[PDB]
Amino acid sequence: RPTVRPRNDVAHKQLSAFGEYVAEILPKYVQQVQVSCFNELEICIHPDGVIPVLTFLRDHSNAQFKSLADLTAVDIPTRQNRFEIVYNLLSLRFNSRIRVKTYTDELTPIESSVPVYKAANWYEREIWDMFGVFFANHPDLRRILTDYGFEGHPFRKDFPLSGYVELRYDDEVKRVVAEPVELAQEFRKFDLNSPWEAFPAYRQPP
Amino acid sequence: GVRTSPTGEKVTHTGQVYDDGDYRKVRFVGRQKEVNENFAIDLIAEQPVSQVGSRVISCDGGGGALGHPRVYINLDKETKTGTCGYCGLQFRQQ
Amino acid sequence: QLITVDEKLDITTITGVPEEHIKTRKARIFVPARNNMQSGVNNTKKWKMEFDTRERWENPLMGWASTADPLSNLVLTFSTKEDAVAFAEKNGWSYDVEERKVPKPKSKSYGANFSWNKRTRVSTK
Amino acid sequence: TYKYVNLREPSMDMKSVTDRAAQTLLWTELIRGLGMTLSYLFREPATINYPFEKGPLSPRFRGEHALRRYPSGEERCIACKLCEAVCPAQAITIEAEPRADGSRRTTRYDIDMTKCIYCGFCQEACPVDAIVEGPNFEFSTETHEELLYNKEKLLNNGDKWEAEIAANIQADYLYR
Amino acid sequence: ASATRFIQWLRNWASGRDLQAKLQLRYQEISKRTQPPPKLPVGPSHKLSNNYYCTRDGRREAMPPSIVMSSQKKAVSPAPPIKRWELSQDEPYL
Amino acid sequence: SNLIEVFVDGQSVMVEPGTTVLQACEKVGMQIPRFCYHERLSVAGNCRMCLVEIEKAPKVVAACAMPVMKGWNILTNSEKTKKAREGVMEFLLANHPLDCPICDQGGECDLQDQSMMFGSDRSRFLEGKRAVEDKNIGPLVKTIMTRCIQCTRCIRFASEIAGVDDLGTTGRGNDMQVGTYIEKMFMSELSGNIIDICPVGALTSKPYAFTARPWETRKTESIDVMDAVGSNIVVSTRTGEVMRILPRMHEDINEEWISDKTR
Amino acid sequence: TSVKPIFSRDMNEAKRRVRELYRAWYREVPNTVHLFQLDISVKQGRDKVREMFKKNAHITDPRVVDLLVIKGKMELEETIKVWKQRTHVMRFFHETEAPRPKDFLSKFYVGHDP
Amino acid sequence: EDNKQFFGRHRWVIYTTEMNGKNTFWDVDGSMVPPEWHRWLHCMTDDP
Amino acid sequence: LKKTTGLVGLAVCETPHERLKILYTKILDVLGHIPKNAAYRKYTEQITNEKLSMVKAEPDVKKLEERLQGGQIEEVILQAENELSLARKMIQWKPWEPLVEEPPASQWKWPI
Amino acid sequence: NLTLNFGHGVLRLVMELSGEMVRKCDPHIGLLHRGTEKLIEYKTYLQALPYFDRLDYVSMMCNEQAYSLAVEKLLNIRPPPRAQWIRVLFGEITRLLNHIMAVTTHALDIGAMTPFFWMFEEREKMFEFYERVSGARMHAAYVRPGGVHQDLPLGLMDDIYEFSKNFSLRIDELEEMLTNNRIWRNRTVDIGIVTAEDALNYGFSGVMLRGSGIQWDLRKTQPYDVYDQVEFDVPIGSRGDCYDRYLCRVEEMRQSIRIISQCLNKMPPGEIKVDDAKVSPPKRAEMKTSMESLIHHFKLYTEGYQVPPGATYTAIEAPKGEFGVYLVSDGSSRPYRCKIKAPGFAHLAGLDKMSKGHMLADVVAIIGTQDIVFGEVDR
Ligand SMILES: CCCCCCCCCCCCCCCCCC(=O)OC[C@H](COP(=O)(O)OCCN)OC(=O)CCCCCCCCCCCCCCCCC
Ligand code: SF4
Ligand code: SF4
Ligand code: SF4
Ligand code: SF4
Ligand code: FES
Ligand SMILES: [K+]
Ligand SMILES: [Zn+2]
């Protein structure tokens, strides 16, 4: 069918089997395992399992996920633990990708994964900067993207798009100064969602 | 259809003009108020009404796919003409 | 090892929000009303949190709507009103909660359109 | 399939060693580099004589915006606001009301040319070919304010450039 | 393309290449700047029958993830081990 | 004791006798597409957008009007149901005018949105379209009746809610037209509500005409003060200006209506 | 009510880190005023440090106090290492911001805000 | 035009010395090309 | 004996067979300190025993590399060192114990 | 130890020097952080597309391709074959654009200014191909979920063939200046050596991996569009230093011409965006004649298409390495979260490691060998 993305059942079966494999070996930490319809395997774990689970996937002979593709967070305010920490790993040996997810709130530290992947260093700094998640035992945790002295964590869903302050050069004090943000044209909020359900397959029970 | 207010400022086709006491007209001092002189309301009025033989006519604005979406205009009312909602051309059943 | 913490969760000192936009704001927690222009009910499933509307004024140059309210566009989504209230509480915003309005179940009967002796009989179809 | 960029063994015979000695002492590869730049000295340069000569463009070029008319002179824009909705930069601001003859027309049509990313989405979205990005790219100004276009400026652009705009649309509309 | 034969010889010798065969300036070999109009083809959904959208609706064939384990025999790898790459036969070594 | 068991895509649900198929689907969060059906008007059954397959039954049923029977399994997403929706949407759009850019309903149109969700993505209508003359019914409601899909919602609202029998259908077949026949103004204290219930841009607000698009409006939920009823309303604003007033549903006060003064 | 700690297991442990941070900031102000060639006095800088500490005196959650200390140490590191420029240091003082009205009548005259 | 020149140098304009009351003997500008010649000079088309 | 593994920093191994026998044997010893019913022990002993049997059954290095499918024999040795390092860490982590804590009810629910 | 506070975009390097030797490199970035990821959450999926042109703004159409593939994967639709070939054709043209910028500005930074001018006249000609299909020389916004915006204009493929026919000679001229030059080799040979194992653990990708002998290229191992249908070789280094990585990039340009040649010959006929008007807008002529087409046009340009809920990590072999997005859909027409994985982010994080035991002037060469654009590093 020309316009429909083809399914790949062989990869779906392989990833499902490996997902059970990981869940059998680390039951102490694995809370949920799922494979998407486009064949991406996700392991959901208790946050205590970050170091053991990542080490296992990096070092075990049937995993060998030697490359950390990405590490990031997602803010979901409706959840008690609003921050979802996502590790995307790549195994060159088995030409495969896996995603490991855990969670944390505003006040609970997450163990730094720098010991497992040196790549995690700056990704964790970015998460701290943009989301305010504190990583424990980081060699050097500090802002990386925002201006010096910047207050707040801009990528949180409740941080306003244009922020709270803005900069200009002031002649009287002969320097750039920060002042509360005023916009000549306010950003125009659009309500785009259709009131008609699009995807029955994802309907939530009432 | 450009006319000047009592203070001399040209009135736009949207009717905009600064009133006598508005400071904002200082922006034109030493410069100019940009006004387009081809008022579309006046230009469309000059187009003749088109006489047709049917109760229903269609308009796409001319130029096929270079015009506007094709719409069908009912011409049953004899008091008035049928007007295209996109381009303003008028039609009348003879 | 875990510790015991009995204080109410409060993060107002570590969120970076200026004091003005914590104490003087009023968060509204509600389920959006169905847009009366459409029959679809899919935009009434979730809880929303918005803030009180503040001044918008005309930009002297172009006439655009200017604002000084950093929260003017902020709108959060929540599964339940407990989740929304929990979020409002820990951020120090005072709030109002409006109970969800659900259309009440109606009794429909096509046959009533042709009642022998009742007023429900329709004069036209 | 792969190949090695840099995996070769130098020949250690006397002739090859002496060849590398000559290169080291007589700077042969450096002289060979001088030959390349010498050959460019005697090539015709690629420079064009701007502004008397211009770089080639195509009918699809996305330049300064303009509001277009029908052949009768009536505005094409009917204030549908599709351009305003799609604008990735929110560079467009529109207000509309019924005209004195009942036509659906805009009373405000502003493009902040310093917000605009010149992406062309507005002219894709427009159902009546009203807003277009024209061929002009030589409209730099001395002040920020001059780049905040209102409807009069955009209608004037359309009247100024319509001769070229129409011809470019004629060349490309069959790809759209 | 206007260089005298002596200068052409000089720069070819200095560079070691036949530069005139592959000039980096463009002349008449480029396509005309006016072309005949296209006539583009239409896609596979351009049919008058046997074309119901529900049989070609990719978005609606998406499904939520399959949960293989929830907290509510031979070893395996995530996929077969990758095959060794083969050395290029076009040019194995630079 | 009174309740009977029916199934919606295999999921059991208990409903009072007389519950329609459409209402049984609401109970599990499934909204059947509709045009003519409005839960505050009498059932009509004429648009046919709500056709739905009943498992083991060869004929689709009009969910809005069919009372659900015990043991029925309502297949809201079957191939038969989907093809029924596509076919109906195809007929609704055959004569509909290409008006969306100039039509005030655009962006909040049930015809647009149900076409997007349940209709095909293209046309195979190769003929010319119907065009219908416009009716003047007063200074509040503009009529562009070429957009009318003959759902008869306005007729039922006028007769049942407003208690005014001035709207009806004249003619027959494809030429059937909604109006007053004679030149008559529909001036009722509740007349403006026909703008809301008209699924398309056939009936639109004259004062509001052309001023705004739905996606750009901010919605402020407020209360009416034009009388002592306390009607719940939504105030639509854009860039600091009040654009229009809409009803807000409150079962115990104004339901989903407001008076013309409030509006 | 059983949560993972950051650094401190109780308020007494947390209040030690606060005092250590305060001392570090107190001793850094004289060098900050000199290195950045600020026009404020050393007393002003320390008065500003104290003011920043005092607005957080009502906190009783050790995890929140830990994060405030964590953030306060990052701010100190930015200053001692001259990652900050002069503009960043002086942003604490809001020199170009005119004094907003605080009493009811003043706020009433100028606008609608509470 | 001179089509023996390489593409880009094969078309050029010698600006007028006076346009719209402005002395343009030395002060020429790319914006002086009217739209009908703008298409040709920029090779947006082949025919003048 | 090959002259280079082709990977920067990965030295050629003169005696790959002896090195692998030592490593795989070391792994089976560490695994003996894990409970018998832990899935990590059962699975790792299975794969380790398969590789060890391949090593003993094939004296030619290039043919052994084909059997193992782990890349260069020097890569296979490095993986054995990684598994041995992992096996020792698992003894302290004990991931075969029951789940430490279930998540909140909607933790993994999406969309919200 | 002297401290130097200062030593593509703009970078702030804080270095510790012991004489000539670099003891610490601390890149301070964020000077081009523009909150792109947060801005994308306020855009429809189409409105977000132009943000990807402005990340690695040397490889515009490859960034577009990565985002388009990610959205196409969540949509569960497939772009048509001609669109796939165009995307590969312009993906490799884009690789030539990037590698010219990478190699000649790397050369320009250490004093060899002349190849920059020769090769930027070739970039100027590829900018014309961009402008001819899209109307823009750089930020084309041409590759979109569902295919490409417009079909190629008549005559474009002939001009691409003419350009490709002569380009390898231009690479040869570049190589005559640098490859065997003893000064160039002195500046790059044994500079910034990274081991295969270190490269993987530090999250390197692309030439930062292959220069060290790792046999990995996503076009070969995890192919997308029609890359499985074209033949080419992956260049591999042996010493993991700057000189080998320079050689890999030069050889990659040659293989790009090889791929481009096959794309020109194998270009098929047909449509250039998915024939599904609930995703890709209809043709303008249909929008102006058919009721369904107009409705779908109206909705796709206002609300946009809804994307079924889910999350995907999608990656491509961009000119600078693995470029991916972690794209989270909540079921609506606006992405809920869009994390952009930029290859230069991990590479720059490894500058301090790579610069150990080197001199100040080598820090310039190492930053150059990494191919750093701060549009994608800072986002
Ligand atoms: C029978 C009895 C006879 C007795 C007498 C015998 C003596 C003659 C035979 C011996 C010949 C001696 C040649 C002397 C020239 C100097 C050679 C030299 O020093 O070159 C070596 C130098 C470094 O070479 P390198 O590859 O970096 O590494 C080697 C050490 N590790 O490499 C360099 O110096 C490179 C220079 C870098 C500068 C580049 C810019 C210059 C390039 C253009 C040069 C043009 C030629 C100059 C002509 C001047 C004309 C006035
Ligand atoms: S070109 Fe793009 S950014 Fe500029 S006004 Fe049009 S849609 Fe907006
Ligand atoms: S320019 Fe076109 S798209 Fe924009 S409002 Fe006018 S008619 Fe609509
Ligand atoms: S009623 Fe709906 S479908 Fe019909 S023209 Fe208006 S917006 Fe379009
Ligand atoms: S005017 Fe509107 S409400 Fe009345 S029948 Fe027609 S579509 Fe239905
Ligand atoms: S909604 Fe049931 S037939 Fe109209
Ligand atoms: K309506
Ligand atoms: Zn018309």
Curated annotation (Swiss-Prot), chain A:
Question: Where the protein is mainly located, per its record?
Answer: mitochondrion
GO-annotated cellular components: mitochondrial inner membrane; mitochondrial membrane; respiratory chain complex I
**Name of the coding gene:** NDUFS3
Subunit architecture:
Core subunit of respiratory chain NADH dehydrogenase (Complex I) which is composed of 45 different subunits. Interacts with NDUFAF3. Interacts with RAB5IF. Found in subcomplexes containing subunits NDUFS2, MT-ND1 and NDUFA13.
Q: Name one GO molecular function term.
A: NADH dehydrogenase activity
Q: Does the keyword Transit peptide apply?
A: yes
One GO biological-process annotation of the entry reads:
mitochondrial respiratory chain complex I assembly
Residues of the whole record sequence present? 46 to 251 of 266
Record's keyword terms, sorted: Electron transport, Membrane, Mitochondrion, Mitochondrion inner membrane, NAD, Oxidoreductase, Respiratory chain, Transit peptide, Translocase, Transport, Ubiquinone
Protein name, per record: NADH dehydrogenase [ubiquinone] iron-sulfur protein 3, mitochondrial
Task: Give the membrane topology, semicolon-separated if more than one.
Answer: Peripheral membrane protein
Question: What does the similarity note say?
Answer: Belongs to the complex I 30 kDa subunit family.
This entry's Enzyme Commission designation comes to 7.1.1.2
Curated annotation (Swiss-Prot), chain B:
User: What topology does it adopt in the membrane?
Assistant: Peripheral membrane protein
* Superkingdom in the source lineage: Eukaryota
What biological-process GO terms show up in the record? mitochondrial electron transport, NADH to ubiquinone
Q: Where in the cell is it found?
A: Mitochondrion inner membrane
A GO cellular-component term linked to this record: mitochondrial inner membrane
- Tell me which UniProt keywords the record has, alphabetically: Electron transport, Membrane, Mitochondrion, Mitochondrion inner membrane, Respiratory chain, Transit peptide, Transport
Report the main location listed first in the record: mitochondrion
Function, as annotated: Accessory subunit of the mitochondrial membrane respiratory chain NADH dehydrogenase (Complex I), that is believed not to be involved in catalysis. Complex I functions in the transfer of electrons from NADH to the respiratory chain. The immediate electron acceptor for the enzyme is believed to be ubiquinone.
Describe the family membership recorded for this protein in Swiss-Prot or TrEMBL: Belongs to the complex I NDUFS6 subunit family.
Subunit structure, interactors included: Mammalian complex I is composed of 45 different subunits. This is a component of the iron-sulfur (IP) fragment of the enzyme.
What protein name applies here? NADH dehydrogenase [ubiquinone] iron-sulfur protein 6, mitochondrial
What species is this protein from? Bos taurus (Bovine)
- The part of the entire sequence present here spans 29 to 122 of 124
Curated annotation (Swiss-Prot), chain C:
Phosphoserine: residues carrying this PTM: S123
For whether the record's keyword set contains Electron transport, the answer is yes
Specify where the region named Disordered lies, as residue ranges.
99-125
Gene Ontology cellular-component terms for this entry are: mitochondrial inner membrane; mitochondrion; respiratory chain complex I
Gene Ontology process terms (BP): brain development; electron transport chain; mitochondrial respiratory chain complex I assembly; reactive oxygen species metabolic process; response to cAMP
A GO term, aspect molecular function: NADH dehydrogenase (ubiquinone) activity
Q: How is it modified after translation?
A: Phosphorylated.
Give the domain of life. Answer: Eukaryota
Subcellular localization, per the record?
A: Mitochondrion inner membrane
User: Keyword set for this entry?
Assistant: Electron transport, Membrane, Mitochondrion, Mitochondrion inner membrane, Phosphoprotein, Respiratory chain, Transit peptide, Transport
Identify its membrane topology class.
Peripheral membrane protein
Q: Does the keyword Mitochondrion apply?
A: yes
**How the protein assembles, per its UniProt entry?**
Mammalian complex I is composed of 45 different subunits. This is a component of the iron-sulfur (IP) fragment of the enzyme. Interacts with BCAP31 and TOMM40; the interaction mediates its translocation to the mitochondria; the interaction with BCAP31 is direct.
Functionally, this protein is described as follows: Accessory subunit of the mitochondrial membrane respiratory chain NADH dehydrogenase (Complex I), that is believed not to be involved in catalysis. Complex I functions in the transfer of electrons from NADH to the respiratory chain. The immediate electron acceptor for the enzyme is believed to be ubiquinone.
* Similarity-based family: Belongs to the complex I NDUFS4 subunit family.
What name does UniProt use for this protein? NADH dehydrogenase [ubiquinone] iron-sulfur protein 4, mitochondrial
The primary gene name is: NDUFS4
UniProtKB/Swiss-Prot annotation, chain D:
User: Which key words tag this protein in UniProt?
Assistant: 4Fe-4S, Electron transport, Iron, Iron-sulfur, Membrane, Metal-binding, Mitochondrion, Mitochondrion inner membrane, NAD, Oxidoreductase, Repeat, Respiratory chain, Transit peptide, Translocase, Transport, Ubiquinone
| Keyword set includes 4Fe-4S | yes
Q: Can you name a GO cellular component term?
A: mitochondrial inner membrane
Q: Name one GO biological process term.
A: mitochondrial respiratory chain complex I assembly
Query: Can you say where in the cell this protein is located?
Result: Mitochondrion inner membrane
Q: Report how it sits in the membrane.
A: Peripheral membrane protein
Q: Please list the residue ranges annotated as the 4Fe-4S ferredoxin-type domain.
A: 68-97, 107-136
Residues annotated to bind [4Fe-4S] cluster 2: C87, C116, C119, C122
Q: Catalyses which reaction?
A: a ubiquinone + NADH + 5 H(+)(in) = a ubiquinol + NAD(+) + 4 H(+)(out)
Record: residues binding [4Fe-4S] cluster 1: C77, C80, C83, C126
Q: Which GO terms describe its molecular function?
A: 4 iron, 4 sulfur cluster binding; metal ion binding; NADH dehydrogenase (ubiquinone) activity
Q: Does the keyword Ribosomal protein apply?
A: no
Q: Which cofactor does it need?
A: [4Fe-4S] cluster
The entry's free-text remark on the cofactor is:
Binds 2 [4Fe-4S] clusters per subunit.
Provide the E.C. number(s) assigned to this enzyme. Answer: 7.1.1.2
Q: Which family does it belong to?
A: Belongs to the complex I 23 kDa subunit family.
| Quaternary structure and partners | Core subunit of respiratory chain NADH dehydrogenase (Complex I) which is composed of 45 different subunits. This is a component of the iron-sulfur (IP) fragment of the enzyme. Interacts with RAB5IF.
The job of this chain, per UniProt, is described as: Core subunit of the mitochondrial membrane respiratory chain NADH dehydrogenase (Complex I) which catalyzes electron transfer from NADH through the respiratory chain, using ubiquinone as an electron acceptor. Essential for the catalytic activity and assembly of complex I.
Protein name listed in UniProt: NADH dehydrogenase [ubiquinone] iron-sulfur protein 8, mitochondrial
Protein encoded by which gene: NDUFS8
Q: Which residues of the full protein are shown?
A: 37 to 212 of 212
